[PDB]
Amino acid sequence: QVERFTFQAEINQLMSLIINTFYSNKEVFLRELISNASDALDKIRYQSLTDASVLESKTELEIKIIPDKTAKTLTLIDSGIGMTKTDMVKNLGTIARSGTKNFMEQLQSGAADISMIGQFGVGFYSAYLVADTVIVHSKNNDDEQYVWESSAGGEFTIALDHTEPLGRGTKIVLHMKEDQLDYLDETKIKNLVKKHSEFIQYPISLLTIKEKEVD
């Protein structure tokens, strides 16, 4: 079963602005997504300080990053608190803070910059600086694994996830744009992850997939 939702008006503007207009430091997306991953890890960790049984679904607190040149995807997986179905609609389809709604006017006027999008809990959408389509798989202890998809257009979808179980956490899949495929190159992404994760307290693994014909 697939359930359709409309983005809240501001989110469409934020997304239109991100997609339609232009920015020069697209690499901030990685910083934002790694920061979200760390936040989620912080959340489950803080829960485990009062109740260590929350960690049972997946004991490792870590981030995994997988560039796939063949699939043209960059995937980021964290074992954070994950999102329930309601959490997904809220966190990926709405703006909560009224302060964030004002910031959208300072951003749209050009006074504010894309790189500060994270200070208002919307750094996620910076993924559309490099990806035409973004898939989010998420699993929270108090609910089932759901999968969230959007390619903008004023709408997103959510379904029960039947792909590989996460145990607990969030998997974001960016279907890269053709012009932004070098983010899947080993040296590029390694240095960018190193740069944008210096203060992150969690381990971060970078996967490299090499393919050679036998001869």
Method: X-ray
Resolution (A): 2.5
Q: Let me know if 2 is exposed, middle or buried by CB neighbors in 10 A (0-12, 13-18, 19+).
A: exposed
Which residue positions form the known binding site? 36, 78, 91, 124
Q: Alpha carbon 51 to chain centroid distance?
A: 27
d(CA 150, CA 8): 13
Element (H, E) at 134: strand 131-139
Per DSSP bridges, beta strands 169-176 and 73-78 are: antiparallel
d(CA 149, CA 61): 25
Quick check: helix, strand or coil at residue 72? Answer: coil
DSSP category for residue 25: -
DSSP category for residue 121: T
Structural domains in the chain? 1-215 (3.30.565.10)
Tell which residue, 131, 101, 105, has the closest CA to residue 32.
131
Which residue positions form the known binding site for ATP? 36, 78, 91, 124
